[PDB]
Amino acid sequence: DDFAKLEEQFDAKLGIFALDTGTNRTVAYRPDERFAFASTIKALTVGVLLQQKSIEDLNQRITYTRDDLVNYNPITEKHVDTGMTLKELADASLRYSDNAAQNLILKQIGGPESLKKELRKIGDEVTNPERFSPELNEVNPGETQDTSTARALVTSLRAFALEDKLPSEKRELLIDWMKRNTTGDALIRAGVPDGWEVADKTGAASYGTRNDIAIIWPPKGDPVVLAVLSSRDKKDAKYDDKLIAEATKVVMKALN
Amino acid sequence: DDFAKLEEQFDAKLGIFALDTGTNRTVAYRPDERFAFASTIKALTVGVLLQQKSIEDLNQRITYTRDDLVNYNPITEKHVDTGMTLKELADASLRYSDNAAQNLILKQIGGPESLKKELRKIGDEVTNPERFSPELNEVNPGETQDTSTARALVTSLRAFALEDKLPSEKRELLIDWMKRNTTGDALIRAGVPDGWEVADKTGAASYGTRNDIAIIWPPKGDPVVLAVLSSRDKKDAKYDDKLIAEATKVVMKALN
Numbered sequence: 001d002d003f004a005k006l007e008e009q010f011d012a013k014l015g016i017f018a019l020d021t022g023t024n025r026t027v028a029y030r031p032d033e034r035f036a037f038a039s040t041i042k043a044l045t046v047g048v049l050l051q052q053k054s055i056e057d058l059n060q061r062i063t064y065t066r067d068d069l070v071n072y073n074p075i076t077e078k079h080v081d082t083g084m085t086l087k088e089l090a091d092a093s094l095r096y097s098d099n100a101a102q103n104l105i106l107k108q109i110g111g112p113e114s115l116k117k118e119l120r121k122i123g124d125e126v127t128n129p130e131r132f133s134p135e136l137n138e139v140n141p142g143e144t145q146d147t148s149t150a151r152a153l154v155t156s157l158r159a160f161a162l163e164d165k166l167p168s169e170k171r172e173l174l175i176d177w178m179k180r181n182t183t184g185d186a187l188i189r190a191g192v193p194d195g196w197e198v199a200d201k202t203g204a205a206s207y208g209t210r211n212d213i214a215i216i217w218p219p220k221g222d223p224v225v226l227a228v229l230s231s232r233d234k235k236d237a238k239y240d241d242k243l244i245a246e247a248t249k250v251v252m253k254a255l256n
Numbered sequence: 257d258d259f260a261k262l263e264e265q266f267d268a269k270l271g272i273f274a275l276d277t278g279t280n281r282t283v284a285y286r287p288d289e290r291f292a293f294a295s296t297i298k299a300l301t302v303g304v305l306l307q308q309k310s311i312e313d314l315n316q317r318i319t320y321t322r323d324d325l326v327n328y329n330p331i332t333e334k335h336v337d338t339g340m341t342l343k344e345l346a347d348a349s350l351r352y353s354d355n356a357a358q359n360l361i362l363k364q365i366g367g368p369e370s371l372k373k374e375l376r377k378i379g380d381e382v383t384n385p386e387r388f389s390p391e392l393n394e395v396n397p398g399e400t401q402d403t404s405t406a407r408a409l410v411t412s413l414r415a416f417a418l419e420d421k422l423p424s425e426k427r428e429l430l431i432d433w434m435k436r437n438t439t440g441d442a443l444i445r446a447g448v449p450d451g452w453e454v455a456d457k458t459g460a461a462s463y464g465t466r467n468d469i470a471i472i473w474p475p476k477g478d479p480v481v482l483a484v485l486s487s488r489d490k491k492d493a494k495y496d497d498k499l500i501a502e503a504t505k506v507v508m509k510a511l512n
């Protein structure tokens with residue numbers, strides 16, 4: 001098995017689940033193993049923002065200071081003086097993984113416990129949002145706060161992006177943002193041929209956790225939804241993006 | 257001088273122009289020397305496309321056939337059967353240097369002769385569009401068809417991307433496609449300090465011509481607009497991407 005081999009090669013533990021929505025074929029490898037979701041949660045978080053706001057409501061302007069800024073604020077740091085609309089915060093959070101943007105959105109939806117409630121409402125009993133960004137990244141093995149599984153992230157991302165947890169114009173915003181992600185070139189995108197459209201959201205945390213979740217549109221045929229998660233046994237361990245890229249090529253082989 | 261030393265190391269001719277939009281300082285080395293523009297023209301071509309369409313017009317679906325495919329078609333070869341929208345064609349052209357994408361876009365704006373006339377209209381009396389792709393890359397020394405200069409490409413790229421040849425929303429589309437280019441990692445991007453954002457478009461053509469034009473954003477402050485062009489004296493000469501990267505570093509020192 002190629003997935004076992006990857007784990008061997010990169011001294012890491014993989015979580016994989018992929019679903020071909022056209023065939024209902026799946027590819028699983030530790031699909032129900034828990035991993036820190038890290039910033040992949042940003043995607044489900046915007047899912048819930050969109051469900052709870054009209055499109056026009058995303059034009060509301062959010063004011064903030066350097067106190068609402070945290071460790072990684074690539075877009076938010078530019079706009080302290082003017083603020084940002086919810087729409088521009090969605091963009092920043094999904095496409096640059098802006099942590100402060102995530103916290104600001106999370107506050108608009110009522111916080112982690114309110115995100116959790118909303119995910120339970122759409123059918124996800126697995127994903128456990130507990131903390132703000134960045135501290136959600138600090139997860140020790142055995143703990144369950146701020147964790148999910150490859151199976152559940154796929155199911156939940158599909159529910160918002162492709163099914164009926166959102167109306168079509170809102171699913172379109174979500175997919176556009178995710179399609180135009182900037183943080184993912186060496187991950188799922190590097191394990192798919194060019195001209196296969198990918199919408200993804202990356203994550204990284206402690207214990208060398210390195211995640212990517214995606215919807216992949218092959219040139220014709222229905223989309224594949226895919227989570228590829230990984231983690232290692234030392235708290236301060238490095239991850240290797242190539243593992244996600246290689247895993248991704250294995251999934252596509254197995255599905256075709 | 258460092259630029260001469262790069263010319264000597266790489267046995268090539270360099271064309272450099274950079275402009276610091278903050279201070280109006282410039283860095284020039286053979287700024288008015290002509291080079292084949294190659295696929296850098298794609299950026300300017302989208303600038304015109306954007307100027308002549310509403311953003312919503314970009315969703316017009318273009319149907320095309322396999323005759324429209326040329327030598328290098330990474331995205332467009334996957335969608336002969338469905339076609340692609342103008343928006344999707346712009347993305348393919350800019351982020352993958354898709355040649356067929358560029359030729360379809362060129363046909364939508366009326367062809368190279370029409371593109372040239374739109375460039376004259378924004379003030380560019382230098383850039384000489386004449387052929388479709390890839391034939392545009394066959395330029396012998398002393399010839400002027402499909403050539404420009406480092407100064408002109410910088411001037412024209414600024415005009416569309418930063419000044420008033422487009423309204424802000426279309427500038428934003430242009431800038432985002434170029435920020436997310438997949439073809440430029442070993443060029444200007446390699447000579448810029450980490451975490452400065454870069455929008456770029458690359459090119460290569462006969463006589464070992466190797467090009468990259470870009471906009472570079474210091475973390476705070478106004479952007480730098482940059483062209484780094486090169487060529488060599490044999491028709492079938494190889495280029496070296498490291499030339500462009502090293503020239504870029506020199507540009508950055510001379511501006512800091």
Ligand SMILES: *C(=O)[C@@H]([C@@H]1N=C(C(=O)O)[C@@H](S[C@@H]2CN[C@H](C(=O)N(C)C)C2)[C@@H]1C)[C@@H](C)O
Pocket residue numbers: 038039040072096097098099133134136137183201202203204205
């Ligand atoms: C996400 O998991 C965390 C923030 N979002 C990120 C991302 O998904 O890219 C991280 S990733 C980590 C930081 N360094 C690596 C890198 O390639 N960069 C320099 C961006 C990846 C980012 C801190 C969030 C939980 O903090």
Ligand SMILES: *C(=O)[C@@H]([C@@H]1N=C(C(=O)O)[C@@H](S[C@@H]2CN[C@H](C(=O)N(C)C)C2)[C@@H]1C)[C@@H](C)O
Pocket residue numbers: 294295296328352353355389390392393439457458459460461
């Ligand atoms: C334009 O310059 C040509 C197309 N655009 C390119 C690019 O910018 O990437 C070229 S150049 C060259 C061929 N191999 C190099 C490479 O490393 N790859 C991207 C695979 C780039 C591409 C053919 C057009 C004029 O043909």
